[PDB]
C-alpha cells in the first residue's frame, strides 16, 4: 500500500510506538511503500489512526 | 456393585505398563478368557469353555487356561498381562491362572 | 425494608437495568430513569404515599427492595477501620427498571397516585401500560 505518518508518537500508548518504529517511519511527514501481507496489514491496522494510507 | 469390575479394570493403567490385558470373564459354569491389545483397539488370542466340556468339573478352566496359553504362545506374547474382574482370587479363577502362568 | 441475616457489606458500580421488566402484576407501573440508590425509607414512604391516596387497598406491588448495606463515620476522621454497619440499607435501581405496580385502580386514579410518590424519589420517573407480554 502507500503509508505516511501524520500524527506523532508523543503521548501515544507503548505498543503503537514500537510499531511506528517497526514500519520504519521516524519523523512525521514520512512516507513509504508497503506489501500486502498478513503481518504487515496487521501492523498498519494497529496504528491506522496515526497514518494517512493513500489507497 | 457394577463398580466392582471398573475398580479393577481401571486399577490396571493399561498402555503405561507396556503389557497386554487378559480379560477373564465368568458367567455360567463356563469361562471365556481373552487377551486384548490395550494401546490398539484390538484383541489377540481367545480361549473358551464354549466348544469344551474338556473337564466335567468347572476347573475345566485348567483346559481353557492352557488352551489360551498355547494359542497365545503361537503368537509369541507371554509376559504377565492378566486382567481380572468382579471375581475374587483362588478357586476357579486361579485354576485358570496357574494353567496360563507356569502353563504358558 | 432492612432484612434478616446476610453477607453484611458492599462496594459500588453501575450498569443498566437487568431484571426489571416493562410490566408485571397489574395494569400500571412505575419506572426509574436514573441510576441511583433507594433506601429502606423512600420506597417505604412511597408505599404509604400511594396507599394513602387509594382506598388503602392492597392492590399495590413493589418490585424493588433494599439489600445493599451502607456505612458512615462513627464520629469523624480516618483513625481506625472501615465501619458503620447499620447506617442504612439501600436498593440499587438502574434505568428502565420497574419500581412499583398497582392493581384495579383507574387511569387518573394511578396517575395521581404515582405522581404523589414521584416526589420522595431521588430520581425522575414515568408510569406505563402493557404491550410487550412476557411470561416464561
Amino acid at each position: 500500500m502507500k503509508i505516511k505518518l501524520v500524527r506523532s508518537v508523543i503521548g501515544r500508548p507503548g505498543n503503537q510506538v514500537k510499531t511506528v518504529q517497526a514500519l520504519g517511519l521516524r519523523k512525521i511527514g514520512d512516507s513509504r511503500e508497503v506489501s500486502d501481507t498478513p503481518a504487515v496489514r496487521g501492523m498498519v491496522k494497529t496504528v491506522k489512526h496515526l497514518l494517512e494510507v493513500q489507497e | 456393585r457394577r463398580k466392582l469390575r471398573t475398580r479393577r479394570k481401571v486399577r490396571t493403567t493399561t498402555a503405561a505398563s507396556g503389557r497386554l490385558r487378559l480379560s477373564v470373564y465368568r458367567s455360567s459354569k463356563h469361562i471365556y478368557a481373552q487377551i486384548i491389545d490395550d494401546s490398539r483397539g484390538q484383541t489377540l488370542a481367545a480361549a473358551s469353555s464354549a466348544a469344551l466340556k474338556s473337564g466335567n468339573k468347572t476347573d475345566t478352566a485348567a483346559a481353557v487356561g492352557k488352551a489360551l496359553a498355547a494359542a497365545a504362545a503361537e503368537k509369541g506374547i507371554k509376559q504377565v498381562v492378566f486382567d481380572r474382574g468382579s471375581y475374587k482370587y483362588h478357586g476357579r479363577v486361579k485354576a485358570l491362572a496357574d494353567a496360563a502362568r507356569e502353563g504358558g | 425494608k432492612r432484612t434478616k441475616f446476610r453477607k453484611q457489606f458492599r462496594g459500588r458500580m453501575t450498569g443498566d437495568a437487568k431484571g426489571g421488566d416493562y410490566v408485571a402484576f397489574g395494569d400500571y407501573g412505575l419506572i426509574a430513569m436514573e441510576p441511583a440508590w433507594i433506601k429502606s425509607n423512600q420506597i417505604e414512604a412511597c408505599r404509604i404515599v400511594m396507599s394513602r391516596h387509594f382506598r388503602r387497598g392492597g392492590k399495590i406491588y413493589i418490585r424493588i427492595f433494599p439489600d445493599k448495606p451502607v456505612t458512615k463515620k462513627p464520629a469523624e476522621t480516618r483513625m481506625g477501620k472501615g465501619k458503620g454497619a447499620v447506617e442504612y440499607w439501600v436498593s440499587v435501581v438502574k434505568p428502565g427498571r420497574v419500581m412499583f405496580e398497582v392493581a384495579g385502580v383507574t387511569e387518573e386514579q394511578a396517575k395521581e397516585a404515582f405522581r404523589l410518590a414521584g416526589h420522595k424519589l431521588p430520581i425522575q420517573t414515568k408510569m406505563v401500560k402493557r404491550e410487550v407480554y412476557d411470561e416464561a
Binding site: - | - | G58, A103, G104
Partner: protein, 180 residues
C-alpha cells in the same frame, strides 16, 4: 402489514423508522427490515393473539404470527420483533389474555377482581380461528374464591398448556385490621 427492503445493512434502518427483525418456519429464515410506524400501529391490533399477512418487495406473500419481541429499556419503542409461521392445523401454542366479563357480586361485596395470570399458552387447532381473547364469567364468585385453569372455556379442543389447578382469577378480600 408490509415491508419492501430487507438488507443486512444496519445503518439504513434508523434513518427512517424501521426495526431490525426476522421470521422463520424452520424451512428457511432471512433478513428483515420493517417500518416501525405502522408496526406498532399493527401489533397493537394483533399481538400473539393473531397472525397477519406479510408482503415483501419482490412479490412474496407469506402469512405469519408474531412470536417474541425484544424491547429497548430506557425507551418505549421495540428493537427486535421475532416472527413465526403457520402450518394448519398443528401450529405452536398461542398466548391468550383473560378478559373477565360481567361484574361479580363479590366485587359488590367490597372485594376486588384480580387476574393472577393472563396470556395462557394453550394450543390448537386452526391458526385462522385463534383464540384472540378469553371470556371468563366472574359473577358466580364472591370472596376468597379462586377460579382455576380447569374452569376456563376453550372450544374446539384446545388443550390447556399449564396445570389444570393453576389459579387464574381470584377475587381479593376487603382491607382488614385488628390490633393496635
Amino acid at each position: 402489514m408490509e415491508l419492501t427492503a430487507k438488507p443486512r445493512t444496519p445503518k439504513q434502518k434508523l434513518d427512517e423508522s424501521m426495526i431490525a427483525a426476522v421470521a422463520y418456519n424452520k424451512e428457511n429464515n432471512v433478513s428483515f427490515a420493517l417500518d416501525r410506524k405502522a408496526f406498532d400501529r399493527a401489533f397493537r391490533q394483533q399481538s400473539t393473539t393473531g397472525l397477519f399477512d406479510i408482503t415483501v418487495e419482490g412479490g412474496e406473500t407469506f402469512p405469519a404470527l408474531v412470536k417474541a419481541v425484544q424491547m429497548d429499556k430506557r425507551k418505549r419503542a421495540p428493537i427486535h420483533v421475532d416472527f413465526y409461521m403457520v402450518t394448519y392445523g398443528e401450529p405452536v401454542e398461542v398466548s391468550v389474555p383473560v378478559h373477565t366479563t360481567g361484574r361479580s357480586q363479590g366485587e359488590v361485596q367490597g372485594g376486588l377482581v384480580d387476574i393472577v395470570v393472563h396470556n395462557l399458552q394453550i394450543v390448537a387447532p386452526g391458526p385462522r380461528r385463534i383464540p384472540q381473547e378469553l371470556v371468563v364469567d366472574v359473577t358466580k364468585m364472591n370472596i376468597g374464591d379462586h377460579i382455576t385453569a380447569g374452569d376456563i372455556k376453550l372450544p374446539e379442543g384446545c388443550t390447556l398448556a399449564a396445570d389444570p389447578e393453576l389459579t387464574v382469577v381470584s377475587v381479593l378480600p376487603p382491607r382488614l385490621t385488628a390490633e393496635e
